[PDB]
Amino acid sequence: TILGLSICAAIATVSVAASTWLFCRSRVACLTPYRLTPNARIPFCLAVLCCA
């Protein structure tokens, strides 16, 4: 159990961290094309997914 519980906890933590990393990377990759526009007009992404 000590081995199995530790393995399960490690797998869950790694999975959660990886999912958060991919979500943040996706948000950056979907916002920066719209974010660094000089006037910063970002209606479309915020309306279709509410990323911000």
Binding site: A29, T32, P33, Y34, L36, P38, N39, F44
Partner: protein, 159 residues
């Protein structure tokens, strides 16, 4: 004619050990500085600004102060085919690519805004390469919807 597009004091140099290696340009109330260029902007007020990186598009952007927003370049979402003005000389737009004569653009010629025939920025060039017998520029422009698309030729040469 060509000299009426170089009286733009709103561009700013980047100093590294007293040398020039790049230019930081202000467009539409936002200051853009090429990421690969190391150094410090000569202007103190713009140098003190904290910029947010953008690795994919290869430039860092910052929000200029309110008092500086008035005197700033104007971007354009339309890029009609043909002639364009640049500080080094004429540039020509064909099939979605900017091209310049041979030997134009080198070490320290990045961050230069490619002005239009009207007199307002349409894109910012980060580097250029010469493949075969033609020279093309890696450059970031602005789409009609404002997605800041970047076009980069294959095997692009920095600056």
């Amino acid at each position: 004619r060509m000299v009426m597009k170089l009286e733009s004091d709103k561009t700013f140099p980047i100093m590294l050990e007293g040398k020039i290696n790049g230019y930081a340009c202000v467009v539409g109330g936002k200051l853009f500085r090429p990421m690969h260029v190391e150094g410090k902007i000569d202007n103190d007020v713009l140098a003190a600004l904290k910029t947010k990186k953008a690795s994919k598009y290869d430039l860092e952007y910052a929000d200029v102060p309110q008092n500086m927003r008035a005197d700033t370049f104007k971007y354009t979402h339309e890029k009609p085919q043909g002639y364009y003005s640049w500080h080094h000389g004429a540039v020509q737009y064909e099939n979605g690519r900017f091209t310049v004569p041979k030997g134009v653009g080198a070490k320290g010629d990045s961050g230069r805004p490619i002005l239009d025939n009207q007199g307002r920025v349409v894109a910012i060039v980060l580097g250029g390469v010469n493949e075969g017998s033609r020279t093309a520029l890696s450059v970031v422009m602005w789409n009609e919807k404002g997605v800041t698309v970047k076009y980069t030729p294959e095997n692009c040469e920095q600056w």
